[PDB]
Amino acid sequence: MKTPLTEAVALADSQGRFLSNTELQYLYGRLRQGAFALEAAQTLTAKADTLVNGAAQAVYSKFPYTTSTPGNNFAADQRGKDKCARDIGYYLRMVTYCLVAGGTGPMDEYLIAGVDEINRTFDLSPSWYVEALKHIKANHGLTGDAATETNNYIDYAINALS
Amino acid sequence: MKTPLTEAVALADSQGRFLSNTELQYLYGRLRQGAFALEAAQTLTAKADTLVNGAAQAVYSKFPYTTSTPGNNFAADQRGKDKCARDIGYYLRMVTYCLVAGGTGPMDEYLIAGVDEINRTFDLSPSWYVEALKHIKANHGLTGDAATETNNYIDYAINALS
Amino acid sequence: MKTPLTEAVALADSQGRFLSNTELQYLYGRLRQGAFALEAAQTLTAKADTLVNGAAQAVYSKFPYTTSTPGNNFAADQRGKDKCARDIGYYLRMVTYCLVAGGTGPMDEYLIAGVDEINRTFDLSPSWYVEALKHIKANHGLTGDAATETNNYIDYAINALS
Amino acid sequence: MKTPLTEAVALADSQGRFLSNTELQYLYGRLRQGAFALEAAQTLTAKADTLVNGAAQAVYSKFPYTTSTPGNNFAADQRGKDKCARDIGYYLRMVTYCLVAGGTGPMDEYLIAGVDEINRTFDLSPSWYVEALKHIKANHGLTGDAATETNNYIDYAINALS
Amino acid sequence: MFDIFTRVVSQADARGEFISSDKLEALKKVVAEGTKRSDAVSRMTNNASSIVTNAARQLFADQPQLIAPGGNAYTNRRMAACLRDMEIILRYVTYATFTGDASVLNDRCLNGLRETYVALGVPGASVAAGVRAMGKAAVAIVMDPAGVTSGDCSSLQQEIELYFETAAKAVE
Amino acid sequence: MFDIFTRVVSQADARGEFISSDKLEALKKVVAEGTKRSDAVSRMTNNASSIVTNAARQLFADQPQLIAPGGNAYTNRRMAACLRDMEIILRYVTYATFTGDASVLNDRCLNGLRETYVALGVPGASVAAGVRAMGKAAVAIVMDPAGVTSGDCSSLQQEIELYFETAAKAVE
Ligand SMILES: CCC1=C(C)/C(=C/C2=NC(=C\c3[nH]c(/C=C4\NC(=O)[C@H](C)[C@H]4CC)c(C)c3CCC(=O)O)/C(CCC(=O)O)=C2C)NC1=O
Numbered sequence: 007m008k009t010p011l012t013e014a015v016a017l018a019d020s021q022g023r024f025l026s027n028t029e030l031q032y033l034y035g036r037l038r039q040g041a042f043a044l045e046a047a048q049t050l051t052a053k054a055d056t057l058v059n060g061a062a063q064a065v066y067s068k069f070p071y072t073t074s075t076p077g078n079n080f081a082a083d084q085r086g087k088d089k090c091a092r093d094i095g096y097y098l099r100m101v102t103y104c105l106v107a108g109g110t111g112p113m114d115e116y117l118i119a120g121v122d123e124i125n126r127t128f129d130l131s132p133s134w135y136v137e138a139l140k141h142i143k144a145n146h147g148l149t150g151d152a153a154t155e156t157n158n159y160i161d162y163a164i165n166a167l168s
Numbered sequence: 169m170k171t172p173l174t175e176a177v178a179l180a181d182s183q184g185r186f187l188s189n190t191e192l193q194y195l196y197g198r199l200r201q202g203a204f205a206l207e208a209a210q211t212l213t214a215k216a217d218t219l220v221n222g223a224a225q226a227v228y229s230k231f232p233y234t235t236s237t238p239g240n241n242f243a244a245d246q247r248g249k250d251k252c253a254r255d256i257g258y259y260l261r262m263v264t265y266c267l268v269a270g271g272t273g274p275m276d277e278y279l280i281a282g283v284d285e286i287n288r289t290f291d292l293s294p295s296w297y298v299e300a301l302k303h304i305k306a307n308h309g310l311t312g313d314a315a316t317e318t319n320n321y322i323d324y325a326i327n328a329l330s
Numbered sequence: 331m332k333t334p335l336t337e338a339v340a341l342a343d344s345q346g347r348f349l350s351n352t353e354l355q356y357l358y359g360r361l362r363q364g365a366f367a368l369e370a371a372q373t374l375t376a377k378a379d380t381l382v383n384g385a386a387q388a389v390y391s392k393f394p395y396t397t398s399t400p401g402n403n404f405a406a407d408q409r410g411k412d413k414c415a416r417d418i419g420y421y422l423r424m425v426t427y428c429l430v431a432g433g434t435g436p437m438d439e440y441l442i443a444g445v446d447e448i449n450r451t452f453d454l455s456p457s458w459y460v461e462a463l464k465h466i467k468a469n470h471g472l473t474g475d476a477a478t479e480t481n482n483y484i485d486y487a488i489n490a491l492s
Numbered sequence: 493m494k495t496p497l498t499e500a501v502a503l504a505d506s507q508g509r510f511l512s513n514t515e516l517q518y519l520y521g522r523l524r525q526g527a528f529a530l531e532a533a534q535t536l537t538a539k540a541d542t543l544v545n546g547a548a549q550a551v552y553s554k555f556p557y558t559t560s561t562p563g564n565n566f567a568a569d570q571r572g573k574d575k576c577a578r579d580i581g582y583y584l585r586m587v588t589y590c591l592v593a594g595g596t597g598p599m600d601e602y603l604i605a606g607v608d609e610i611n612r613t614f615d616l617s618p619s620w621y622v623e624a625l626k627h628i629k630a631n632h633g634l635t636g637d638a639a640t641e642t643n644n645y646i647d648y649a650i651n652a653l654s
Numbered sequence: 655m656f657d658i659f660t661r662v663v664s665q666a667d668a669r670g671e672f673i674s675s676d677k678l679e680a681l682k683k684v685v686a687e688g689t690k691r692s693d694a695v696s697r698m699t700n701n702a703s704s705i706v707t708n709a710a711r712q713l714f715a716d717q718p719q720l721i722a723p724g725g726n727a728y729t730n731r732r733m734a735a736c737l738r739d740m741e742i743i744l745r746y747v748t749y750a751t752f753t754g755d756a757s758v759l760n761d762r763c764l765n766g767l768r769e770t771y772v773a774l775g776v777p778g779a780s781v782a783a784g785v786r787a788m789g790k791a792a793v794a795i796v797m798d799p800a801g802v803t804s805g806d807c808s809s810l811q812q813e814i815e816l817y818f819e820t821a822a823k824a825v826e
Numbered sequence: 827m828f829d830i831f832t833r834v835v836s837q838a839d840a841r842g843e844f845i846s847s848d849k850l851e852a853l854k855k856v857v858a859e860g861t862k863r864s865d866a867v868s869r870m871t872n873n874a875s876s877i878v879t880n881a882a883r884q885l886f887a888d889q890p891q892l893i894a895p896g897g898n899a900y901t902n903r904r905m906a907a908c909l910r911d912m913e914i915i916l917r918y919v920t921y922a923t924f925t926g927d928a929s930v931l932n933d934r935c936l937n938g939l940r941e942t943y944v945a946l947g948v949p950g951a952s953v954a955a956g957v958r959a960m961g962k963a964a965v966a967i968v969m970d971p972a973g974v975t976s977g978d979c980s981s982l983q984q985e986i987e988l989y990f991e992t993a994a995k996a997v998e
């Protein structure tokens with residue numbers, strides 16, 4: 007739960023102090039952010055389906071042993087590729103939620119806290135989702151300020167995975 | 169020599185007619201194919217050494233026994249490895265010619281005519297080159313019409329090979 | 331630092347009481363263990379060099395994309411394979427130390443505590459060392475009780491990695 | 493059906509002549525062959541179960557991987573072993589028919605017509621049946637004209653097989 | 655021989671009038687989905703030979719009397735003849751779904767399939783079951799997209815299903 | 827926290843005289859079968875991770891809600907925590923068959939677990955199905971023999987089925 011407003015409330019709350027001018031600035035600085043952020047969330051919602059299909063294409067082209075070698079984790083048959091579409095769709099949707107909230111807290115809460123044990127026990131190499139997020143950040147084609155926000159955004163995703 | 173221009177010429181030769189508008193549409197289709205086939209052959213020629221190297225390595229890990237037992241088809245010592253890698257490089261070069269020619273003719277004339285016969289008399293197995301081409305079609309990592317046109321050529325070689 | 335003797339000392343220190351009758355048995359039970367354990371450590375020291383070479387063979391045959399795809403983590407060139415010989419030699423030596431000490435503490439202290447971040451940041455898929463330890467536990471050919479102790483042993487290694 | 497009597501009849505049919513003395517000599521040669529070929533087929537039919545059983549076990553020890561990897565041609569489970577032993581029993585029964593017919597006709601019609609084609613479309617390897625026939629021709633243990641006439645039929649099947 | 659365009663031409667020539675506007679709208683729909691005809695024909699011609707082996711695989715797991723000696727598919731020559739029959743049957747299915755009209759498959763298989771199969775002694779039941787299983791596998795490989803841009807394909811599914819049932823009631 | 831040796835001790839103390847001869851035959855045969863018992867425990871904990879993932883993979887194949895959004899184990903840390911709970915239940919049932927008594931199991935982990943899963947909103951029947959499938963694989967791993975002398979572990983197959991059953995029924 008990291009949005010700038012809840013962190014201002016937590017600071018005032020932890021401190022026990024009443025709301026102040028310092029907290030107030032965040033709200034109209036969340037204007038510099040949000041005035042492009044909601045636009046970028048809508049255009050990502052439009053771009054979404056071709057983004058997951060291209061990311062699945064890039065992951066399969068980078069690592070052919072996934073589509074070749076038979077296994078539960080590997081996408082040899084149909085149902086593995088269905089799991090891949092589910093996983094990359096989850097990643098893109100958490101990027102959209104992270105973009106709308108303004109902070110990494112939805113993404114940090116819904117993805118990052120358990121990804122190390124899941125990648126350890128279920129044999130999911132994180133470099134696959136590295137490929138997927140790099141293909142998304144190359145393919146999304148955001149313009150101006152919104153695009154810059156995503157890079158800081160999607161790089162945080164790769165840094166949590168790597 | 170499966171070339172849609174030359175196949176159209178051979179057709180109109182067999183009919184004994186002049187050039188019909190069917191052949192004009194045939195030329196249109198050939199230009200439509202080439203308009204991405206040339207760029208696809210370009211990036212394939214860029215990737216070709218890593219492709220044949222990963223394909224040879226993947227076939228060696230795919231069957232450990234060809235590295236293991238001393239035999240004449242198998243790569244016990246390094247000369248067999250050289251001949252094996254020469255064969256997969258030959259395969260990928262035929263794929264590039266097959267792509268740039270617009271049809272299966274370079275593949276047909278240069279591989280498909282007697283491949284199973286030399287595999288019979290040398291006691292090779294075509295499944296080695298099958299899984300090699302599977303690794304190549306997993307490794308080229310392209311998207312679009314060019315990617316699936318190349319993939320169509322590759323699985324044509326797989327189907328005629330097995 | 332898990333050997334049965336230091337854990338007996340740690341229990342007696344935490345309770346603040348001198349060793350009881352139960353504590354004494356611990357070491358003559360370390361006789362049921364050690365009377366084969368030192369033999370098995372010596373025969374592993376003899377088996378060691380062919381064990382690492384066969385484990386490198388099995389890892390390269392299981393995953394051909396390591397020997398094919400160029401990268402820093404992958405063993406495409408010589409120096410990557412030298413790093414592989416170093417890593418599997420480290421694993422086998424920690425197995426020998428773990429066998430001589432009697433508990434997992436040397437192995438748990440020298441390998442297990444940082445393996446998750448190293449596999450995360452350096453892109454080392456742990457299924458490679460799964461292959462390596464499974465090939466070692468198949469190839470070591472230990473006799474009787476010594477073999478079983480190692481197996482519980484090597485399964486703990488795979489369970490820490492997976 | 494390669495039978496020297498019927499081949500003589502087909503020859504005299506193509507000439508349109510009556511029976512010549514060449515055909516009388518042909519009949520003499522057929523009787524000379526049969527005068528030991530029948531007893532050789534008798535002892536082959538006596539030995540046949542041990543022959544196909546030792547041949548299957550020898551091919552299984554000859555290539556361990558067909559027992560090892562799960563595949564559709566290979567004998568991973570016991571049904572593939574049954575189909576494999578059925579195939580070598582079919583081979584030896586064709587050898588007995590080939591012997592008793594005086595020519596390669598039962599072999600030709602019942603095996604040689606499309607053996608390499610079904611080996612191609614099923615991804616079998618003919619070398620398996622080659623080394624099987626080598627074990628059979630090593631195992632029958634006969635002497636005399638009958639032994640080498642059978643051996644001639646066996647290596648004819650080997651040569652046409654490869 | 656007969657394409658769906660030439661089908662419309664032959665109807666309009668038998669009537670002898672110009673083509674109706676709504677039929678031309680149907681042809682506009684057809685040329686709108688011609689890329690999906692290309693998608694399907696390319697997909698199943700990619701996997702065609704493996705489909706033939708899997709169809710023979712289910713047929714020979716189903717009816718072991720064919721492999722059994724004295725069976726019609728017993729001998730090596732007849733086995734290659736079987737795979738020849740199934741391969742050219744799937745080939746004419748690909749011809750028909752490329753053209754869009756069943757006239758190619760009808761006029762080059764309906765005539766003598768039943769005839770050869772009763773004249774030789776071929777059991778038409780096995781070929782009918784085999785072309786049914788081959789058609790199910792063909793729909794299975796055509797319909798599911800693997801890295802392919804999404805769309806509806808129910809009309810194509812109906813088309814190749816109709817083509818395989820015409821083959822099945824051709825051989826019976 | 828009770829070994830079966832100190833079960834006999836505490837029962838004889840609440841009685842208040844010495845341990846009788848019949849309990850001593852029983853304890854001697856306990857000593858003759860505890861060999862089976864202790865390393866039955868460790869071969870159960872040999873494949874404990876693969877047992878845990880196989881039981882969870884079966885559970886989320888049987889109940890697709892728990893990986894569907896809105897389900898209990900949907901988000902990533904809740905799914906990881908569910909894997910943690912299944913590992914904990916397997917580890918404590920492993921402790922219980924090492925002690926030879928279900929007292930460690932009912933004493934250490936099961937008791938407040940029922941109220942914890944009810945107060946969290948966690949389904950209990952899903953856990954019951956998971957521990958039952960996990961127990962089946964658990965005996966069979968121990969039960970199957972690979973590089974071990976043939977022996978009668980029937981009691982072990984017996985008692986570990988009892989321990990997994992008490993775990994699943996106490997989760998409810
Ligand atoms: C909301 C955040 C979120 C994440 C990150 C997530 C990861 C995740 N991916 C899973 C499976 C999977 N994910 C993949 C995907 C891949 N594996 C590969 O080898 C491919 C390269 C890659 C495709 C890009 C596959 C194949 C499985 C199947 C594992 C199995 O079937 O046992 C599972 C197991 C759940 C199940 O059985 O369906 C989880 C929890 N789940 C989540 O809910």
Ligand SMILES: CCC1=C(C)/C(=C/C2=NC(=C\c3[nH]c(/C=C4\NC(=O)[C@H](C)[C@H]4CC)c(C)c3CCC(=O)O)/C(CCC(=O)O)=C2C)NC1=O
Binds near residue numbers: 262
């Ligand atoms: C343009 C298309 C084209 C291809 C593909 C081609 C292949 C080809 N591979 C050959 C042999 C061979 N091929 C192999 C290959 C292998 N053994 C192995 O370990 C590997 C699994 C496999 C690598 C693919 C070997 C070992 C030989 C020599 C056989 C022997 O040494 O007796 C030969 C026989 C002549 C010779 O090298 O010595 C031909 C003609 N020729 C062509 O014109």
Ligand SMILES: CCC1=C(C)/C(=C/C2=NC(=C\c3[nH]c(/C=C4\NC(=O)[C@H](C)[C@H]4CC)c(C)c3CCC(=O)O)/C(CCC(=O)O)=C2C)NC1=O
Binds near residue numbers: 402410
């Ligand atoms: C004592 C316990 C111990 C462990 C476990 C250990 C792991 C370990 N492996 C490393 C590298 C490596 N380990 C490998 C080995 C492999 N990678 C692959 O792709 C192959 C499949 C596999 C061969 C089996 C390779 C290729 C590197 C090179 C990384 C680099 O050069 O950047 C490094 C980086 C150190 C260096 O740069 O030399 C560490 C710390 N080191 C230790 O000291």
Ligand SMILES: CCC1=C(C)/C(=C/C2=NC(=C\c3[nH]c(/C=C4\NC(=O)[C@H](C)[C@H]4CC)c(C)c3CCC(=O)O)/C(CCC(=O)O)=C2C)NC1=O
Binds near residue numbers: 551568572577579
């Ligand atoms: C009278 C002469 C005659 C012969 C010899 C003959 C062979 C023959 N073997 C076949 C298959 C087969 N052959 C094998 C054989 C093997 N895989 C192995 O592990 C062994 C190395 C090898 C034993 C030789 C297998 C496994 C199949 C089935 C292929 C698969 O299951 O898809 C088939 C395809 C039909 C079927 O069984 O299911 C034929 C026709 N037919 C004949 O009419």
Ligand SMILES: CCC1=C(C)/C(=C/C2=NC(=C\c3[nH]c(/C=C4\NC(=O)[C@H](C)[C@H]4CC)c(C)c3CCC(=O)O)/C(CCC(=O)O)=C2C)NC1=O
Binds near residue numbers: 727735763777
């Ligand atoms: C272009 C359209 C076209 C078709 C379709 C066609 C079929 C055709 N199938 C034939 C045979 C055959 N077809 C089969 C079929 C089968 N085996 C069985 O037992 C099963 C019931 C079925 C397996 C699929 C067999 C065994 C033969 C050989 C019959 C014989 O040896 O007399 C023959 C006899 C010639 C030969 O020996 O090859 C023709 C002409 N011909 C054509 O011109």
Ligand SMILES: CCC1=C(C)/C(=C/C2=NC(=C\c3[nH]c(/C=C4\NC(=O)[C@H](C)[C@H]4CC)c(C)c3CCC(=O)O)/C(CCC(=O)O)=C2C)NC1=O
Binds near residue numbers: 696
């Ligand atoms: C042979 C080399 C080659 C291929 C592959 C080719 C494919 C091809 N399939 C296309 C469209 C399409 N193709 C499909 C077909 C399908 N999608 C599905 O979901 C079904 C599984 C499947 C039908 C069986 C659909 C739905 C579209 C887009 C909308 C439409 O036209 O219906 C398009 C139009 C734009 C595009 O999507 O790229 C092309 C170029 N052209 C070629 O030259």
Ligand SMILES: CCC1=C(C)/C(=C/C2=NC(=C\c3[nH]c(/C=C4\NC(=O)[C@H](C)[C@H]4CC)c(C)c3CCC(=O)O)/C(CCC(=O)O)=C2C)NC1=O
Binds near residue numbers: 898899946950
């Ligand atoms: C020593 C014995 C002991 C047990 C058993 C125990 C259980 C336990 N399970 C918990 C959560 C959980 N338990 C599950 C359970 C499951 N997921 C499902 O969908 C199935 C119904 C079930 C798997 C069997 C889930 C999803 C959570 C996470 C709920 C949450 O943390 O929000 C929590 C809350 C803390 C947390 O992990 O976040 C505790 C304390 N604690 C203990 O100290």
